[PDB]
Amino acid sequence: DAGFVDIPKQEKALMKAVATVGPISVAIDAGHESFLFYKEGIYFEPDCSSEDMDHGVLVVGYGFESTESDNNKYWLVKNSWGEEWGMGGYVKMAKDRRNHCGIASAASYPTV
Amino acid sequence: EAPRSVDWREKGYVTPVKNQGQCGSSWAFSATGALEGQMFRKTGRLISLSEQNLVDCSGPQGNEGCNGGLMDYAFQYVQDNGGLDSEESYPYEATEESCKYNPKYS
């Protein structure tokens, strides 16, 4: 009756929700030039906050780069800055690296 | 166990990438993307929904148009409103305008 389900603040809970529900809304800290000028690859910003998120985006999946030897998992994220930003408008956000950029801190989806 | 890889775009749940322009409305694009996915999950129909309907009309639920908002406040508006218009019927203007569903004063 609130119209949505809140996911606990944990990347494993987020992974289970993405796998069982579909795309999930999340918020991230997008306040770094590395993200403003992002073009490709797994995005990892050492100075990202897991508490101060300022930009809503959409997790549409997750996966891993098998040719990278460690730190190789990512969230598939759809952004809203057009297709010219990132990978056709998408970014691979580091996954299972201590809730990088707060991706699991404010995750939810609507009930329909 | 959860699969090792998931990509809902391959299953038809995700519309093309949009551009919020000069407006602090990412909360509305995040919320329409999650709603487009759950309406495809429910009905098998993928329809681009209106971020402008959220920017203009969800002030009662706590959002602030181009000055920021929260996806959960947009989801409360959808439940209060009984749905959300399509992008084609209520297109994006990248500025907060009047809610046509507000009678206002007469």
Short mmCIF file of C-alpha atoms in Angstrom, two decimals:
data_model
loop_
_atom_site.label_atom_id
_atom_site.label_comp_id
_atom_site.label_asym_id
_atom_site.label_seq_id
_atom_site.Cartn_x
_atom_site.Cartn_y
_atom_site.Cartn_z
CA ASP A 1 0.00 0.00 0.00
CA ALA A 2 3.08 2.30 -0.12
CA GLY A 3 3.46 1.18 -3.75
CA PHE A 4 7.02 -0.21 -3.45
CA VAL A 5 9.40 -2.65 -1.74
CA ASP A 6 12.63 -1.41 -0.07
CA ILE A 7 15.65 -3.79 -0.38
CA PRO A 8 18.00 -4.08 2.64
CA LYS A 9 21.28 -2.21 2.33
CA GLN A 10 23.44 -5.12 1.21
CA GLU A 11 24.82 -6.11 -2.17
CA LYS A 12 23.88 -9.77 -1.80
CA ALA A 13 20.23 -8.79 -1.02
CA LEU A 14 20.34 -6.48 -4.09
CA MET A 15 21.74 -9.26 -6.26
CA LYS A 16 18.90 -11.63 -5.20
CA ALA A 17 16.30 -8.93 -5.89
CA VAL A 18 17.71 -8.14 -9.33
CA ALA A 19 17.67 -11.90 -10.15
CA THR A 20 14.09 -12.49 -8.96
CA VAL A 21 12.26 -9.19 -9.66
CA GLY A 22 13.71 -7.41 -12.70
CA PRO A 23 15.39 -3.94 -12.97
CA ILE A 24 15.75 -2.15 -9.60
CA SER A 25 15.96 1.56 -8.87
CA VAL A 26 19.07 2.58 -6.92
CA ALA A 27 20.92 5.74 -6.02
CA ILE A 28 24.67 6.29 -6.33
CA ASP A 29 27.32 8.86 -5.54
CA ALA A 30 27.84 10.30 -9.08
CA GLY A 31 29.80 13.32 -7.87
CA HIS A 32 33.26 12.51 -9.32
CA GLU A 33 34.76 13.58 -12.64
CA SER A 34 35.65 9.88 -13.27
CA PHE A 35 31.87 9.25 -13.51
CA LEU A 36 31.05 12.44 -15.44
CA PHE A 37 33.59 11.46 -18.13
CA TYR A 38 33.03 7.70 -17.91
CA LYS A 39 33.36 5.87 -21.22
CA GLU A 40 33.85 2.09 -20.70
CA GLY A 41 34.95 -0.76 -18.46
CA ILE A 42 34.19 -1.50 -14.84
CA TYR A 43 33.82 1.77 -13.01
CA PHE A 44 35.69 1.97 -9.66
CA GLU A 45 36.33 5.27 -7.94
CA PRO A 46 38.40 4.99 -4.70
CA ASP A 47 36.87 8.21 -3.38
CA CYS A 48 33.20 7.18 -3.77
CA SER A 49 30.90 7.35 -0.76
CA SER A 50 28.58 4.46 0.24
CA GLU A 51 26.42 6.95 2.22
CA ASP A 52 26.16 10.08 0.20
CA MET A 53 24.25 9.19 -2.97
CA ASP A 54 22.93 11.93 -5.18
CA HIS A 55 21.78 10.36 -8.48
CA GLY A 56 19.11 7.81 -9.24
CA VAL A 57 19.87 5.12 -11.85
CA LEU A 58 18.55 1.64 -12.77
CA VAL A 59 20.27 -1.71 -12.19
CA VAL A 60 19.25 -3.94 -15.10
CA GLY A 61 21.58 -6.92 -14.37
CA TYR A 62 25.03 -7.91 -13.16
CA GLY A 63 27.92 -10.08 -14.39
CA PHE A 64 31.70 -10.40 -14.43
CA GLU A 65 34.68 -9.79 -16.85
CA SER A 66 36.42 -13.22 -17.04
CA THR A 67 39.63 -11.67 -18.57
CA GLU A 68 40.17 -9.51 -15.43
CA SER A 69 42.00 -11.45 -12.69
CA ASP A 70 40.27 -9.95 -9.55
CA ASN A 71 37.79 -7.15 -8.77
CA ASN A 72 35.99 -8.39 -11.87
CA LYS A 73 32.28 -8.29 -10.96
CA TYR A 74 29.90 -5.46 -11.92
CA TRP A 75 26.33 -4.20 -11.83
CA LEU A 76 24.86 -3.30 -15.27
CA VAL A 77 23.46 0.23 -14.76
CA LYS A 78 21.27 2.27 -17.07
CA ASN A 79 21.88 6.02 -16.69
CA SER A 80 19.75 8.94 -17.97
CA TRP A 81 22.42 11.21 -19.57
CA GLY A 82 21.70 9.95 -23.13
CA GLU A 83 23.38 7.39 -25.30
CA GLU A 84 26.50 9.47 -25.83
CA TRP A 85 27.66 8.99 -22.20
CA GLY A 86 29.29 5.75 -21.08
CA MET A 87 28.61 2.55 -23.04
CA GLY A 88 25.60 3.61 -25.08
CA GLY A 89 24.25 5.24 -21.86
CA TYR A 90 25.16 2.35 -19.55
CA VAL A 91 27.89 1.90 -16.95
CA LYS A 92 29.37 -1.24 -15.39
CA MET A 93 29.54 -0.34 -11.67
CA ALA A 94 32.00 -2.29 -9.45
CA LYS A 95 30.07 -5.03 -7.60
CA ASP A 96 30.96 -6.73 -4.27
CA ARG A 97 33.54 -4.01 -3.49
CA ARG A 98 32.14 -2.83 -0.22
CA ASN A 99 28.88 -1.32 -1.59
CA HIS A 100 30.80 0.89 -4.04
CA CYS A 101 29.20 4.37 -4.53
CA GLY A 102 26.29 3.28 -2.31
CA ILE A 103 24.62 1.23 -5.02
CA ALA A 104 22.85 -0.97 -2.47
CA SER A 105 22.07 1.86 0.05
CA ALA A 106 18.73 3.05 -1.41
CA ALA A 107 17.41 0.26 -3.61
CA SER A 108 13.69 -0.29 -4.28
CA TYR A 109 11.14 -1.25 -6.92
CA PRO A 110 7.42 -0.56 -7.39
CA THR A 111 4.58 -3.05 -6.69
CA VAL A 112 2.22 -3.50 -9.68
CA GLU B 1 21.75 -19.68 -5.70
CA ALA B 2 21.35 -16.48 -7.80
CA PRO B 3 22.69 -16.92 -11.36
CA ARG B 4 26.24 -15.67 -12.03
CA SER B 5 24.97 -13.19 -14.66
CA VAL B 6 21.61 -11.47 -15.25
CA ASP B 7 20.73 -9.00 -18.02
CA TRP B 8 17.04 -8.02 -18.19
CA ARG B 9 17.58 -6.12 -21.42
CA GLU B 10 17.85 -9.54 -23.14
CA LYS B 11 14.38 -10.43 -21.82
CA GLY B 12 12.59 -7.34 -23.06
CA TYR B 13 12.20 -5.46 -19.76
CA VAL B 14 14.13 -2.27 -20.63
CA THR B 15 13.38 0.67 -22.85
CA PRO B 16 16.08 2.64 -24.80
CA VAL B 17 18.32 5.13 -22.87
CA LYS B 18 16.80 8.53 -22.21
CA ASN B 19 18.37 11.95 -21.46
CA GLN B 20 17.08 13.98 -18.44
CA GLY B 21 18.64 17.14 -19.97
CA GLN B 22 19.01 20.28 -17.85
CA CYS B 23 16.78 19.12 -15.01
CA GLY B 24 17.56 17.32 -11.70
CA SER B 25 15.07 14.55 -12.46
CA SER B 26 17.21 11.36 -12.36
CA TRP B 27 14.83 10.13 -9.63
CA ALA B 28 12.01 10.20 -12.18
CA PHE B 29 14.03 8.32 -14.91
CA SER B 30 15.11 5.69 -12.34
CA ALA B 31 11.49 5.26 -11.22
CA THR B 32 10.01 5.02 -14.74
CA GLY B 33 12.69 2.48 -15.67
CA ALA B 34 11.80 0.25 -12.70
CA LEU B 35 8.05 0.68 -13.44
CA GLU B 36 8.52 -0.09 -17.16
CA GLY B 37 10.25 -3.33 -16.07
CA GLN B 38 7.54 -4.36 -13.56
CA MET B 39 4.72 -3.56 -16.04
CA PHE B 40 6.52 -5.71 -18.64
CA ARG B 41 6.86 -8.44 -15.94
CA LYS B 42 3.06 -8.22 -15.31
CA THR B 43 1.71 -7.85 -18.85
CA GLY B 44 4.39 -8.65 -21.38
CA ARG B 45 4.03 -5.09 -22.78
CA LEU B 46 7.05 -2.70 -22.71
CA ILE B 47 5.92 0.92 -22.92
CA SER B 48 8.06 4.01 -22.30
CA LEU B 49 6.48 5.88 -19.35
CA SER B 50 6.36 9.57 -18.55
CA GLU B 51 9.01 11.15 -16.36
CA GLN B 52 7.24 14.50 -17.02
CA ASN B 53 4.06 13.19 -15.31
CA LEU B 54 6.25 12.51 -12.25
CA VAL B 55 8.15 15.83 -12.41
CA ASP B 56 4.93 17.87 -12.67
CA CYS B 57 2.54 15.92 -10.45
CA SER B 58 4.35 14.20 -7.58
CA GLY B 59 5.01 17.30 -5.42
CA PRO B 60 2.34 16.09 -2.85
CA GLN B 61 4.33 12.90 -2.36
CA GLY B 62 7.54 14.87 -1.59
CA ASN B 63 9.31 15.43 -4.90
CA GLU B 64 10.72 18.73 -6.03
CA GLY B 65 10.58 18.59 -9.86
CA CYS B 66 13.88 19.59 -11.42
CA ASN B 67 15.28 20.31 -7.93
CA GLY B 68 15.46 16.66 -6.93
CA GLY B 69 13.29 13.81 -5.70
CA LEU B 70 13.27 10.22 -4.60
CA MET B 71 12.20 7.11 -6.50
CA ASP B 72 10.09 5.93 -3.53
CA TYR B 73 8.11 9.21 -3.59
CA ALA B 74 7.51 8.64 -7.36
CA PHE B 75 6.33 5.07 -6.62
CA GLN B 76 3.91 6.40 -3.97
CA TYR B 77 2.55 8.84 -6.61
CA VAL B 78 2.03 5.95 -9.06
CA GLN B 79 0.05 4.01 -6.53
CA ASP B 80 -1.98 7.11 -5.53
CA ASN B 81 -2.64 7.96 -9.18
CA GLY B 82 -3.46 4.39 -10.36
CA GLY B 83 -0.61 4.31 -12.91
CA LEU B 84 1.46 6.72 -14.96
CA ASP B 85 0.97 8.14 -18.48
CA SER B 86 3.14 7.05 -21.41
CA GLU B 87 6.04 9.16 -22.65
CA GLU B 88 4.25 9.56 -25.97
CA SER B 89 1.14 11.02 -24.33
CA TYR B 90 2.90 13.17 -21.69
CA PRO B 91 6.34 13.97 -23.21
CA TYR B 92 9.40 15.21 -21.43
CA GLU B 93 10.11 18.95 -21.24
CA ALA B 94 13.15 19.01 -18.91
CA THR B 95 11.37 21.70 -16.75
CA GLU B 96 8.67 21.52 -14.13
CA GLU B 97 5.22 22.51 -15.53
CA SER B 98 1.67 22.48 -14.21
CA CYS B 99 0.10 19.14 -13.41
CA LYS B 100 -2.90 18.87 -15.75
CA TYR B 101 -4.45 16.48 -13.31
CA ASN B 102 -4.59 19.36 -10.68
CA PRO B 103 -7.95 21.22 -10.91
CA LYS B 104 -6.31 24.19 -9.15
CA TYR B 105 -8.71 27.01 -8.14
CA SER B 106 -11.83 28.06 -9.90
#
